[PDB]
């Protein structure tokens, strides 16, 4: 399931950074940025492998990549945020 919608302004500022980098094809901070998201628990709508790509949203103070990600879908109209490494997602509204 997708847990409603979230304004980009309501996300950490690092989420804006991630979206800017997604649009410019990098530079990405982590080697895994851009990898296909498998959606292996079917939390997001079912799509063929390659539909979804994942990108780290840097967590300040973290040692690892932390649990924040943006998952992109079709074109630039279907970006999801997860704060909990894929347990839940919300559709991002980049206009607010």
From Swiss-Prot:
CDD domains: RNase_Sa. Keywords: Disulfide bond, Endonuclease, Hydrolase, Lyase, Nuclease, Secreted. The gene is rnaSA. Its EC number is 4.6.1.24. Changing residue 39 to A/D/S: Decreases protein stability. Belongs to the ribonuclease N1/T1 family. GO terms for cellular component: extracellular region. Its main location: secreted. It comes from Kitasatospora aureofaciens. GO terms for molecular function: lyase activity; ribonuclease T1 activity; RNA binding; RNA endonuclease activity. It is found in: Secreted. This is Guanyl-specific ribonuclease Sa. It holds the Pfam family Ribonuclease. It is an enzyme of class 4 (lyase). InterPro entries: N1-like, Ribonuclease/ribotoxin.
């Amino acid at each position: 399931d997708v847990s409603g919608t979230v304004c980009l302004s309501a996300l950490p500022p690092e989420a804006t950074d991630t979206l800017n980098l997604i649009a410019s094809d990098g530079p990405f901070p982590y080697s895994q940025d851009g990898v296909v998201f498998q959606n292996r628990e079917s939390v997001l709508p079912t799509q063929s492998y390659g539909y979804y790509h994942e990108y780290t949203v840097i967590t300040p103070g973290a040692r690892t990549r932390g649990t924040r990600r943006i998952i992109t879908g079709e074109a630039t109209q279907e970006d999801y945020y997860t704060g909990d490494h894929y347990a839940t997602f919300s559709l991002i509204d980049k206009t607010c």
